[PDB]
Amino acid sequence: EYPTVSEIPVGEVRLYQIADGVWSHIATQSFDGAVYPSNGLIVRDGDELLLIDTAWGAKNTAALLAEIEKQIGLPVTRAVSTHFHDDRVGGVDVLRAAGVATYASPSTRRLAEVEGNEIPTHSLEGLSSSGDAVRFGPVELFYPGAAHSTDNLVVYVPSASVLYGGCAIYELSRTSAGNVADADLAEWPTSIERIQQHYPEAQFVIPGHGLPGGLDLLKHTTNVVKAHTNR
Ligand SMILES: O=C(O)c1nccn1Cc1ccc(C(F)(F)F)cc1
Ligand SMILES: [Zn+2]
Ligand SMILES: [Zn+2]
């Protein structure tokens, strides 16, 4: 079963096999007085591993690397952060110290600097405008437009039809937007429409936080985001 928030003490990381050579990583962290789960992705990249997002903090990200070594045993050589918040870049300094080359869009690197968050080393080119897609090893990176944040990326694994939505996509059980300080509520539904249009074949959809689902998570997120904008 997919691990839930109460099953992971803060500081531990679980891996979940989605498909051949495709895993999510699940961690937990405190935020605004509660503890929340958070997802990232791991994709086999030949003899190496590509990491999508940190495990939300230095300690968790160190535990992530240890669990990957224990369970998969291939080196993590590159990591992409899908936006500038701490559940995506928190732990980049640990990754860099471990020998991982860290990447993000120029916007994400800039926003992380402005916010005082950790800054991935390398800039991803070709993602500056809504609808842009680039290949990065075994995945496609897609910028759908502003949503959860202005810089948020999504990631698609063609070999398994896996769509990692990041924090732009909510889990089914989440019925409120909660904290949306950095969101673009007006653009979020349009950005979700671009995801739907670009990845209509997605079979597994991973939200930034919580349980995987299918393309229904896109319509669900639009519902929640709009309901928040109505009142
Ligand atoms: O919304 C975000 O992206 C976020 N990042 C860090 C903290 N949050 C708030 C958040 C709200 C609800 C959940 C859920 F209950 F779904 F697990 C998880 C996280
Ligand atoms: Zn975020
Ligand atoms: Zn988040």
Bound molecules: the ligand O=C(O)c1nccn1Cc1ccc(C(F)(F)F)cc1, zinc ion
User: What structural class results from the helix and strand content?
Assistant: alpha/beta
Shape: globular
Distance from first to last alpha carbon: 36 Å
Share of residues in helices: 25-40%
* Order of helix and strand elements from N to C terminus: EEEEHEHHEHEEEEEHEH
Estimate the strand proportion: 25-35%
Spatial order of the strands forming the largest sheet = 1-2-3-4-5-6-7
What kind of sheet is the major sheet?
7 strands, mixed
Number of domains: 1
What is the rounded Rg?
A: 16 Å
Strands, count: 12
| Separate helix tally | 6
PDB class: hydrolase
Keywords: Metallo-beta-lactamase VIM-2, VIM-2, hydrolase
Assembly: monomeric
Entry title: Crystal structure of VIM-2 MBL in complex with 1-(4-(trifluoromethyl)benzyl)-1H-imidazole-2-carboxylic acid
